[PDB]
Amino acid sequence: SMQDPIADMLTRIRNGQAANKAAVTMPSSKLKVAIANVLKEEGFIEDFKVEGDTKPELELTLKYFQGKAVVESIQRVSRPGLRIYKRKDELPKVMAGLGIAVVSTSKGVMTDRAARQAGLGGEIICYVA
Amino acid sequence: ATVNQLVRKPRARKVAKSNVPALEACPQKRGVCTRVYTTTPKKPNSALRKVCRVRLTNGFEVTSYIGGEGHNLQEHSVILIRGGRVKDLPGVRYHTVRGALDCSGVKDRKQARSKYGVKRPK
RNA sequence: GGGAGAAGGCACGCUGAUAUGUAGGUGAGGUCCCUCGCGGAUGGAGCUGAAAUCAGUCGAAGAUACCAGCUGGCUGCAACUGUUUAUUAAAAACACAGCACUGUGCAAACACGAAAGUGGACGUAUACGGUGUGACGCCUGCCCGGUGCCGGAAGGUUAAU
RNA sequence: UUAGCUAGUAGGUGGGGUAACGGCUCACCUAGGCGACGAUCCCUAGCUGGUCUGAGAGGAUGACCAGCCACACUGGAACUGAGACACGGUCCAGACUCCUACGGGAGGCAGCAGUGGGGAAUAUUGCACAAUGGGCGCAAGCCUGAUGCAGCCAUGCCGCGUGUAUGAAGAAGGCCUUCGGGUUGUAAAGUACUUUCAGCGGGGAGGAAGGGAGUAAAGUUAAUACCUUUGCUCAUUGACGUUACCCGCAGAAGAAGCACCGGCUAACUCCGUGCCAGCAGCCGCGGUAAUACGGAGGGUGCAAGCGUUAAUCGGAAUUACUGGGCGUAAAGCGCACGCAGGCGGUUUGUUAAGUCAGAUGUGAAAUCCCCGGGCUCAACCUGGGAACUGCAUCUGAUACUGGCAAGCUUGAGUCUCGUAGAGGGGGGUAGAAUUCCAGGUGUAGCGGUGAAAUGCGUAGAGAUCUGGAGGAAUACCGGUGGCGAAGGCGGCCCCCUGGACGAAGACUGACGCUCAGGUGCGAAAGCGUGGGGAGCAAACAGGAUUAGAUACCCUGGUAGUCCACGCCGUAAACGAUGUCGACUUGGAGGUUGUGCCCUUGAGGCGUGGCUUCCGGAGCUAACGCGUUAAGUCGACCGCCUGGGGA
RNA sequence: GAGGGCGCUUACCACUUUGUGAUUCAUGACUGGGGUGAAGUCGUAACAAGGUAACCGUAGGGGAACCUGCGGUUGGAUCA
Ligand SMILES: [Mg+2]
Ligand SMILES: [Mg+2]
Ligand SMILES: [Mg+2]
Ligand SMILES: [Mg+2]
Ligand SMILES: [Mg+2]
Ligand SMILES: [Mg+2]
Ligand SMILES: [Mg+2]
Ligand SMILES: [Mg+2]
Ligand SMILES: [Mg+2]
Ligand SMILES: [Mg+2]
Ligand SMILES: [Mg+2]
Ligand SMILES: [Mg+2]
Ligand SMILES: [Mg+2]
Ligand SMILES: [Mg+2]
Ligand SMILES: [Mg+2]
Ligand SMILES: [Mg+2]
Ligand SMILES: [Mg+2]
Ligand SMILES: [Mg+2]
Ligand SMILES: [Mg+2]
Ligand SMILES: [Mg+2]
Ligand SMILES: [Mg+2]
Ligand SMILES: [Mg+2]
Ligand SMILES: [Mg+2]
Ligand SMILES: [Mg+2]
Ligand SMILES: [Mg+2]
Ligand SMILES: [Mg+2]
Ligand SMILES: [Mg+2]
Ligand SMILES: [Mg+2]
Ligand SMILES: [Mg+2]
Ligand SMILES: [Mg+2]
Ligand SMILES: [Mg+2]
Ligand SMILES: [Mg+2]
Numbered sequence A: 001s002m003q004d005p006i007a008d009m010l011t012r013i014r015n016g017q018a019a020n021k022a023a024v025t026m027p028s029s030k031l032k033v034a035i036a037n038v039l040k041e042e043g044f045i046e047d048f049k050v051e052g053d054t055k056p057e058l059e060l061t062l063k064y065f066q067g068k069a070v071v072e073s074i075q076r077v078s079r080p081g082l083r084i085y086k087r088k089d090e091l092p093k094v095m096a097g098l099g100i101a102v103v104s105t106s107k108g109v110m111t112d113r114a115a116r117q118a119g120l121g122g123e124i125i126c127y128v129a
Numbered sequence B: 001a002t003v004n005q006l007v008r009k010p011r012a013r014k015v016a017k018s019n020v021p022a023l024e025a026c027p028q029k030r031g032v033c034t035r036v037y038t039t040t041p042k043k044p045n046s047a048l049r050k051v052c053r054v055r056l057t058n059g060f061e062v063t064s065y066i067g068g069e070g071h072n073l074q075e076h077s078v079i080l081i082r083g084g085r086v087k088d089l090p091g092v093r094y095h096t097v098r099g100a101l102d103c104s105g106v107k108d109r110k111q112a113r114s115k116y117g118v119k120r121p122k
Numbered sequence C: 001g002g003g004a005g006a007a008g009g010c011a012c013g014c015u016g017a018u019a020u021g022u023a024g025g026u027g028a029g030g031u032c033c034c035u036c037g038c039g040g041a042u043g044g045a046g047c048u049g050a051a052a053u054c055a056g057u058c059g060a061a062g063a064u065a066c067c068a069g070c071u072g073g074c075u076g077c078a079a080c081u082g083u084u085u086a087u088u089a090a091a092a093a094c095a096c097a098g099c100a101c102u103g104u105g106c107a108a109a110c111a112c113g114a115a116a117g118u119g120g121a122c123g124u125a126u127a128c129g130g131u132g133u134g135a136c137g138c139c140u141g142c143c144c145g146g147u148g149c150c151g152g153a154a155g156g157u158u159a160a161u
Numbered sequence D: 001u002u003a004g005c006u007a008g009u010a011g012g013u014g015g016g017g018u019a020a021c022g023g024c025u026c027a028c029c030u031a032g033g034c035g036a037c038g039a040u041c042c043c044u045a046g047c048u049g050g051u052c053u054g055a056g057a058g059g060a061u062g063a064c065c066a067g068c069c070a071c072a073c074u075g076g077a078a079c080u081g082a083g084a085c086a087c088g089g090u091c092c093a094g095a096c097u098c099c100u101a102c103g104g105g106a107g108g109c110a111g112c113a114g115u116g117g118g119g120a121a122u123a124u125u126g127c128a129c130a131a132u133g134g135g136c137g138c139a140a141g142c143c144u145g146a147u148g149c150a151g152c153c154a155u156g157c158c159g160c161g162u163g164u165a166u167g168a169a170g171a172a173g174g175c176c177u178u179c180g181g182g183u184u185g186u187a188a189a190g191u192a193c194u195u196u197c198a199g200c201g202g203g204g205a206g207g208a209a210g211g212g213a214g215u216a217a218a219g220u221u222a223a224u225a226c227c228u229u230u231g232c233u234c235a236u237u238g239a240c241g242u243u244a245c246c247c248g249c250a251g252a253a254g255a256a257g258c259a260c261c262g263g264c265u266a267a268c269u270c271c272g273u274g275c276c277a278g279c280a281g282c283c284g285c286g287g288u289a290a291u292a293c294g295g296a297g298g299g300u301g302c303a304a305g306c307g308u309u310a311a312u313c314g315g316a317a318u319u320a321c322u323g324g325g326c327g328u329a330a331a332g333c334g335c336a337c338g339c340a341g342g343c344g345g346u347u348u349g350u351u352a353a354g355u356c357a358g359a360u361g362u363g364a365a366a367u368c369c370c371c372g373g374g375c376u377c378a379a380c381c382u383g384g385g386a387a388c389u390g391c392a393u394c395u396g397a398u399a400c401u402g403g404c405a406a407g408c409u410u411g412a413g414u415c416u417c418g419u420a421g422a423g424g425g426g427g428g429u430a431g432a433a434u435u436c437c438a439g440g441u442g443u444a445g446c447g448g449u450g451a452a453a454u455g456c457g458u459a460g461a462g463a464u465c466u467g468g469a470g471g472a473a474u475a476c477c478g479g480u481g482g483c484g485a486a487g488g489c490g491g492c493c494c495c496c497u498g499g500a501c502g503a504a505g506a507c508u509g510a511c512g513c514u515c516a517g518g519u520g521c522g523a524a525a526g527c528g529u530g531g532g533g534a535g536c537a538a539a540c541a542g543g544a545u546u547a548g549a550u551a552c553c554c555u556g557g558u559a560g561u562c563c564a565c566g567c568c569g570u571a572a573a574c575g576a577u578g579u580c581g582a583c584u585u586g587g588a589g590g591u592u593g594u595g596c597c598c599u600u601g602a603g604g605c606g607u608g609g610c611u612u613c614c615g616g617a618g619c620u621a622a623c624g625c626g627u628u629a630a631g632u633c634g635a636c637c638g639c640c641u642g643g644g645g646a
Numbered sequence E: 001g002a003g004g005g006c007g008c009u010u011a012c013c014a015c016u017u018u019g020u021g022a023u024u025c026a027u028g029a030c031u032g033g034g035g036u037g038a039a040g041u042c043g044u045a046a047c048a049a050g051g052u053a054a055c056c057g058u059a060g061g062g063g064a065a066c067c068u069g070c071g072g073u074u075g076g077a078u079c080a
Helices: A003-021 A030-042 A112-118 B002-007
Strands: A021-026 A055-062 A074-076 A101-106 A122-128 B028-039 B050-054 B061-065 B079-084 B094-096
Touching: A003 A021, A003 A030, A003 A074, A003 A122, A030 A055, A030 A101, A030 A122, A101 A112, B050 B079, B061 B079
Parallel strands: B061 B094
Antiparallel strands: A021 A055, A074 A122, A101 A122, B028 B050, B028 B079, B050 B061, B079 B094
16 A cells, blocks of 8 residues: 655655666656655756646656766655654754755745754655765 | 554563672671582682682571682681672672671782782781 | 352341331222123222331340251262161162163064963164163273184084984 | 452532532432553552763662652540641550559650661761841840751862982892893982971951940920931950961971783783682683782882772663664564554645744752852852753644545446356266175285295185275376465366456445454364274384384284364464565566457467566675565564573 | 530440451472583484484374374485
8 A cells, every 4th residue: 555655756766766767757746746846956856847637747857977876865754654843953954964854844845954044843854865 | 663563562671680689789798607618610620619608697698709818717707798709600609808807818918908808018 | 050058247126207008919989982791091099018217215135935057178989869678787888871892684682481472562773682880071001821702614523323 | 470440439419517619428319430541459669850871862860958748656536726637735545665652653866966776887975056047025135956166987079298409330139130231220328409288386367247335317296205217436246266377497207008910901020839729800711830820020000099899871783762673593473354553545625733933931949061250279159141952821834744625546446248277165976996795717825025024825825807895086187287365275077156367448436554452264183972994004913123122124903094063273384584555677488368460380569467497786694585575665563682491 | 594514325436356368478298390510321313315304283102312193394415
């Protein structure tokens, strides 16, 4: 039973990067598009696009820099069954600022750094390094 | 394993028992000698190590070991049992700290006198 | 299923209230209906009538007379009810349900019968007789040397004729 | 390895009672209340701010002090009093102690000191109310074993000193010595210098603020009387106190010990025994030198302390939430169903519980940390700040989880047409073969073994034929072929029936996954009853081997293996790999279905399910897994924490 | 006289007493198993194809390791 779509997306992109794939098509979602927007903004991916009327499908394009995959480690944090909620003071920092610790809060899902800048906490979604 | 299983059954500790049961969290215990004798240690070691079956004042009766060279212990002697085991002596778990009420210090010793109750030479 | 009425303990007289007799039971007369009588719905008039609560009261004693279990623990035997020496032994003695063996194909075995015949049985191998042990749980381990029983007539002996 | 507890107990009606609400209690009514989110029961335990360890998370803990609670020889009770069921107030009961003239009476130091007893271990029968309070009093004034101090203890922390510049004949002596030298060693002697601290003789702040005796102004008041307030100078009050502190005396005096030296760990050389004495925290040492025991030299470390013991934590990621594993080191229940519980595809609307931001109250004081100050300095004290990571309330957000509502099929499931299969249950029938029964031929052997023998034979054994009886399973098919959740299923037919897969469709609409407790199935062996029993075959007998053989070799041979109905839930029940969803290079096959192309031949291209062998990345301690992963993740359950004991 | 004291009684009630259960501790003739050891006695069961392949569940038997039958595994070596 598919009980976590975010984990499925992370697994798909991590396997595509390992297998040196070009595009990873998957069934999309509102949160998937919101996370893909953050990935495009942070430059960890190359492009994301939602193509579908009745069943929307996200087709992300993998980004490669001199052979090495741009994303080093993708990790789910607040998996279903263990929810993590940290305030503004205790927001995580991935790889001493070299990685993102994406946070979802009231003002959308922008990123950990933007959440700290705005002064609001939230729930951790994905660690991308 | 899983967080739900941990919440259900807590990650319990593992209580370890002390190696000096007859002390009851006490450094020294005064007792009276009952059986003074010598025993042969386990192989490959071989000796005539001097031990003593002594009954403590709390009620426990254990066997301790006499250190140094030469002692004046016998039946109906008051000694001060101290916590410490001997590896090559099966059953011995304690010693008799010298300089106590009756177990005098070792004779003709001028090094490590703190552990054997020997006075400072003049 | 039982031990068990285990052991042990509490109240028991009388009077007055609840209730001038209660809960309950029986059950009048007057409306009703009949395809009308020994009838069918209401009715509690009358009679009978527990059990308990509260208070008071008299005696040393209120299941006050008669009648009317002493109790527990260990242990051998027999499972148990029962039966047994009329008239000194009622028991561990017999029987018992259960178990095992054996014989028995019906005109059955067996028994009473000189015999007819009968019982078994107006039954038919889940039926009947005999012999051992004797509810139930764990089981019935070795031996045919000897005496019985069953199967054989290759050989030896063997009556009457 | 504590699954039920409670009959004033749940609640209600009415009355009585405390300062009030209250089964606080009685009198009636409704049988409820608590409990797998641990009721009830057992053991232990004062709680907290705090303390120690740890980077943190955590673990242990409650010394001093502070706040709360409970108790005054033990149990019960009540009175006064605002305030108690009251440490030195009351009564009774039990024990102890002590007077009695035997009728009778007195006491409770877990208060401050001290005594007896216990223990490894706890200190004086000290001064003062001078300061702070408390109690009483208009005030003076009285009491305080609170308190302020005095004495002992290295019990804990900190500071100081126990000298110093030198000083080579590298004095002397000691130690070993390759006997030429080295070590102690600038160490010591000697010289110059200082006198901290201790002793002597003196000065000597400060903790002391007030109070009484007098004089004035104001406030009163008929009244400067009387009183209060405000001031004013004088006479006054100290346990510490031989006060802190400073000054001069003279001399280096009056002051250093403890542990270790093979590795962990900082430090090596000789002498003495000789697995003896002995060391020991682990590895381990002592059997003529073990740098490991004892002695010496030397060095190492700390220092008025040094080591051991007692206890906690780190290391121990060795209970892992931070921060682990289950194929083989310990770890997937034998399998399936399923309750509670956990999680949950996709879109929108509503709310704001979880979440987030701000503010308020609070989180006592003491304590940690930061910035400063005072004792000559530190320990110590102190001011401010921070912190107390927590809770409650109010105000705003819906991205996410959850509550509600309205939609979708991509998850799940149904119908329609077909396909394969030893899937399960029940009943029949064919055949080979084995074993018996009877008969016909039939003559000296048969069977068996490494070798024989027990065993079967002239009473006709073994061989063959004929006829008949009985039980089991179905030679070839037959394959890493097929099915089944697992266990497991194989001649053929008949009846019932479960499950699985495929082209093209239609349909409900999250109905989905896991699942402690529970339920069901479940190899063989085993047990009970009723049957049957051909062959095989535990136990058992005999023969054989062996020094011995209660066994492997052989001949018999009962239970059992065959059937029906019942009990257990045991296997290396294995793929030593739990159930479900998604992704990840490839090759060579087996089985089963379907689509298309000219199917002239299992010609060619595709497309789903199961299954088999290699093999890339990746993983793993490695064997090995490798699209059916042991590669990366998601949801859940079960299990593991050294080997024995077990 | 009201009302209050002494006495008496009733209700609650401590000490104490009776019977029967539950749990824990110590002891107890005798008895089973387990762990330690020194030149003690018997056998060779496992490790090779350990010389009868091992191992598991079960039942029986034996002084003992073990043996046998049934069902499963290769965590057995050779090999048509
Ligand atoms: Mg009536
Ligand atoms: Mg007798
Ligand atoms: Mg008997
Ligand atoms: Mg009888
Ligand atoms: Mg008689
Ligand atoms: Mg009789
Ligand atoms: Mg008899
Ligand atoms: Mg017999
Ligand atoms: Mg005979
Ligand atoms: Mg005969
Ligand atoms: Mg009541
Ligand atoms: Mg820890
Ligand atoms: Mg006392
Ligand atoms: Mg009190
Ligand atoms: Mg005292
Ligand atoms: Mg005072
Ligand atoms: Mg010299
Ligand atoms: Mg060492
Ligand atoms: Mg581990
Ligand atoms: Mg193993
Ligand atoms: Mg294992
Ligand atoms: Mg399994
Ligand atoms: Mg300062
Ligand atoms: Mg504080
Ligand atoms: Mg929602
Ligand atoms: Mg069977
Ligand atoms: Mg045989
Ligand atoms: Mg034999
Ligand atoms: Mg297993
Ligand atoms: Mg399931
Ligand atoms: Mg492979
Ligand atoms: Mg199997």
